[PDB]
Every structure is written in structure tokens, then in C-alpha cells.
Amino acid sequence: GLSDGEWQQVLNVWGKVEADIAGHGQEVLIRLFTGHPETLEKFKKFKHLKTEAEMKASEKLKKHGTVVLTALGGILKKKGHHEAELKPLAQSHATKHKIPIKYLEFISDAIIHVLHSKHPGDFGADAQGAMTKALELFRNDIAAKYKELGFQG
Secondary structure (H helix, E strand, O other), X not given: OOOHHHHHHHHXXXXXXXXXXXXXXXXXXXXXXXXXXXXXXXXXXXXXXXXXXXXXXXXXXXXXXXXXXHHHHHHHHOOOOOHHHHHHHHHHHHHOOOOXXXXXXXXXXXXXXXXXXXXHHXXXXXXXXXXXXXHHHHHHHHHXXXXXXXXXX
């Protein structure tokens, strides 16, 4: 799994995120939607937003960015023992939203991009590799539950 020093670097940069969760949530979703527009079709509340400018202006989008990063934060803080927190997210994303594992990779990359852009001093090479393995672990564990849930992500 991750070493203790790898989780520390994950939680250090997550502290930066938590100092402005709304701004981070908003930039992550914009990067996702602009880089991979097919992801935006999953969002009945948003899919009409056609441009970055419209997305920045969207209060609903910003609130959803908060929801998404808040959940991922709870998961990352559980380090290697996140089964409990992961369970309900796999559930809704396998039944209600149907989010393919590929879309979770896209948002993992969007998070790494935003973290590198906004916090380079807390997101150097080692920290970026640690967050990479942490998001891989998140995806692999979701994918395992998807299969139980009967969703081929």
C-alpha cells in the first residue's frame, strides 16, 4: 500500500485543499469537464454549461465540487483502511450515477493537475507520486465494489 511518509504527504497537501475546499472543488470539476466533456453528460444539473466561463459562474457546480472533495477527503484520511467510507460512494456510483472507472481516472488526473497548479510547494515529485498511488488505491477499491454491485465500470 502506501508508506507512512507517503500518507503524510497526501494529508499535507489535502490540508491545503481543506483551507479552501470550494475553490478547489470548483477548479477540479472545471478541469474534468473541459478536458473530458463526455463526463459532463452525467450531470443533469450541469450538462447545459457549455463553456469554462459558464462553469465558473455556476453556484450549483461549486457546491457539488465541495461535496466531491469533502467525500474524497474523508476517504484519504482513512489512509489504508477506508472500506467503511468507500462503501456508500461505490454504492451510489454503481447504481444511481453509473460512473465508469475511466471517469474516476480522469478526475484523479484533474485533482493532480489542480494540486500541482495551486500548491507546487506542497506538491513536489514525491508528494505527487504519493497522491497518485492514493488515488489509484481509491479507484482499485471502488472497482472491486462495483463488481460486487453488478456494475461493470
